[PDB]
Symmetry: C2
Subunit: 324 residues, 2 copies
């Protein structure tokens, strides 16, 4: 019954799976919703149509032949001025967050909401983004930015409303933790790196993950959402593994946020956890966290395996929340 | 800014903790809400006032001296006709669910919503309750009826919207599982029972828990919420421990719901779980479940310790959802 029009920016693993999810959702949902896509962009192409054929976009993108699509081409700024409801940002993250900030400003000014899977704008320019949203009376959600497809922001926003959240601890950065755990198997860094590269576990440029900066960016978003702080990266603590030492079987890079000495605090630190720690029960592919609350107890939430499809499922959850 | 008026029925462990929670929430919430109580009842007293003094009610109830409260007394039916927004049902559960059915009918007809922690009406008369709600354009939520304070219905309703939920497995009935695990420690039933009685783990009448009927009632609610079925108790399978045999360390009474052979299905069965099963990681005081979804992955959610305060926190979450 109700049709919501989307413009999707980014067709990497998350954005492409989001298209697949939209098609199945439109077919199957009991929610009285239909999502219509009017615009898709990737790094090479930007296509607009009143009713993009989502199946065709998926097919052409899988075949590596979006070149051959005959839709109107318009720039991102032009697309933002067309009539639609919500922007999805599944683009590559910039180093400094400026392109994301400028993009959300232009989105809100054009009267659209944002759902993002890109954490860069939020980790660097949170108060500016929220002020543009407020100014323009628009909304932004960002489930997929921290803990992938594991409900976290929706969990906070709809499941523990009565609490004033006392503390978050979790494994939210898997690649650095993978390396830590392999090193604890008494392996050499260069052997771990070599294999992780062949497996596609680690990128060509692994610095952001292995210095703990990926965790730090996530912790800014977490801390600001939980405590209403306006932090940027410089407000949080982090550390990484790049320093020669042995690691124990119980060490993890744990991201923790709470109000400490009256001030919101966020830190990602390598800790040797007690043997019965819930975080030690998580597999190398599993994101999870412990949420300590003053009214809804201490809650443990995790998935079994993190991946882009479940991440795109979190984006889709945000889209439904904004629509309903 | 926005005031929501409540009538609270039941001042046992959940209802009394709910009063405490309302007082702290009113003081502390950033949600722009205030909850005003106009009516409280327990088994002995029924008090109405435009603005019940919640602190006084707590104090008198703790001191065992609600006798001495000077507010108007009116019957439950009279109270339902006064002006307010939401009924909270934290009363003792009847055997057959009829009193709960009649109560919700009268509530909806008087133009109020229901939040319940009592599972009896829902386990026996779900389709009738939902029809009265629909007829009267009112709503009912029931977070606290299954898995206590662990978000479950709100989790389904707000965190995994895009999924068509494929399966639920969990430990939702702690007392029977406590007995199973103690028996697996090579103890005799009568010794386990004797101690459990002194500890307050088991009631004077332990039949509903130990025959698996408590689990079965929860599974009706679960299955109907997940699959849109209209089941009653006779539609689900259950079993208990009351039969002489040894139990293994890996046995649990697991409640499982899913669509099986095209039909919604719900069963609570004693299973010997594989050693790496997530449900085996839960302490004897911990409720938890695994939710397998087609769009949001497989999610594991649990608390550390179940108790009436966190249960009342789930009731409070439902109240906020209905108000906001």
């Amino acid at each position: 019954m109700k049709t919501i029009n989307l413009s999707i920016f980014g067709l990497g693993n998350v954005g492409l799976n989001l298209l697949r999810i939209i098609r199945s959702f439109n077919e199957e949902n009991r929610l009285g919703l239909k999502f219509n896509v009017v615009f898709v962009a990737d790094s090479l192409h930007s296509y607009y149509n009143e009713r993009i054929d989502i199946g065709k976009v998926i097919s052409y993108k899988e075949k590596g032949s979006l070149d051959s699509l005959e839709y109107e081409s318009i720039s991102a700024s032009e697309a933002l001025a067309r009539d639609f409801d919500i922007v999805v940002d599944a683009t590559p993250a910039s180093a400094d967050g400026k392109k994301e900030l400028a993009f959300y400003k232009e989105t809100f000014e054009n009267g659209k909401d944002v759902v993002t899977a890109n954490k860069s704008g939020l980790a660097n320019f949170w108060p500016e983004i929220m002020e543009y949203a407020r100014s323009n009376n628009r909304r932004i959600r960002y489930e997929a930015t921290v803990a992938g497809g594991v409900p976290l922001f929706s969990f906070i926003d709809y499941s523990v409303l009565p609490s004033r959240i006392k503390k978050f601890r979790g494994i939210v950065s898997l690649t650095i933790n993978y390396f830590i755990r392999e090193l604890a198997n008494k392996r050499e860094f260069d052997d771990v790196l070599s294999e992780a590269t062949k497996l596609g576990i680690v990128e060509k440029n692994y610095k952001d993950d292995l210095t703990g900066l990926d965790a730090a960016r996530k912790s800014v978003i977490l801390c600001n959402h939980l405590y209403g702080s306006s932090y940027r990266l410089s407000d949080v603590f982090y550390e990484g593994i790049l320093q020669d030492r042995s690691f124990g079987k119980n060490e993890r890079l744990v991201t923790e946020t709470g109000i400490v000495n009256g001030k919101p605090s966020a830190e990602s630190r390598i800790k040797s956890l007690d043997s019965n720690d819930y975080l030690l029960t998580l597999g190398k592919g599993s994101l999870g966290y412990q949420l300590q609350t003053d009214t809804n107890g201490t809650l443990n939430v995790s998935d079994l395996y993190d991946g882009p499809y479940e991440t795109a499922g979190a984006v889709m959850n945000d889209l439904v929340i904004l629509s309903m």
